[PDB]
């Protein structure tokens with residue numbers, strides 16, 4: 001792909017984080033803690049899952065960023081509406097305001113309803129995410145495999161400002177402690 005020149009500097013929004021997440025000082029890395037991280041509750045925090053939003057809001061234009069997923073067993077990545085549900089149980093779908101892919105149990109899937117199987121021969125260590133607001137497109141790229149396409153959501157109905165979306169996943173297995181990291185431009 002040739003989307004690199006739309007690169008944006010994403011930072012994580014602490015206030016949106018599930019209370020178990022640990023965000024680095026530079027707001028560019030996040031991981032699952034082994035306990036509640038001693039923050040107050042608020043209406044923005046994702047309560048049921050290890051999720052956090054980027055601080056940036058997008059309502060026009062083309063945007064690109066990269067995320068490091070090295071040695072994780074489970075994660076979700078993409079974008080979502082600013083007004084997605086924060087509390088209780090919900091599925092990641094465009095109907096609920098999410099445009100995401102994930103790794104789960106050694107398979108990759110796109111968060112359509114129902115979910116779509118992805119075909120990845122080279123397990124990615126870094127994922128590229130491209131958003132074209134005007135066109136209604138969200139695309140995912142395998143940076144480990146020379147930028148190969150993973151998935152395109154087209155005919156997207158954003159219906160609001162978008163925010164970068166992250167889920168570090170649970171660590172029930174003891175094999176999923178590694179962080180998500182925003183990669184430098």
Ligand SMILES: CCc1nnc(NC(=O)[C@H]2CCCO2)s1
Nearest residue numbers: 018020047048049050170171172
């Ligand atoms: C999302 C809030 C919670 N997350 N933390 C909780 N429990 C856990 O995840 C424990 C058991 C597996 C590893 O740590 S409740």
